[PDB]
Amino acid sequence: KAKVKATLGEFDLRDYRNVEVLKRFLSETGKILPRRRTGLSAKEQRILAKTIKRARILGLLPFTEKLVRK
């Protein structure tokens, strides 16, 4: 569909507290989205996943969700 990167302005993707931003990079099942979807550079996507994994331990982001209407 349309890339998640393209729907945002600047943002520090080292920022493991900005759950508002971070959360659009997760799927409806709280799974880290692949680059095909996130629209990221390899290097960026590496840094992302790292800080997504931080948010998660902080309690700020989900490790999982359940799929609604299936």
Partner: protein, 101 residues
Amino acid sequence: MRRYEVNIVLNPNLDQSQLALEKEIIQRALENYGARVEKVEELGLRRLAYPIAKDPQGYFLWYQVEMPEDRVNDLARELRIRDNVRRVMVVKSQEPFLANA
């Protein structure tokens, strides 16, 4: 000293009595390990993505700090002895990598 970032998550059902007592048991430990405290933040209450310690929310501290590296694990050990202290995550500071200019 390296520059670090100390996230603490607290029990969301506290009152000035303990909350403020915790916050200084913290200051004592931070100080007692050599932690100068630059910036500090406190968004405080917030909705967790999954329950921590049976409870659906958490109270969020965040401290920027400079301090001696040979102790930073020791400090972290001390912080979580406490019971209303639920998550401690000490993290090296980092230049903000940004995206989309």
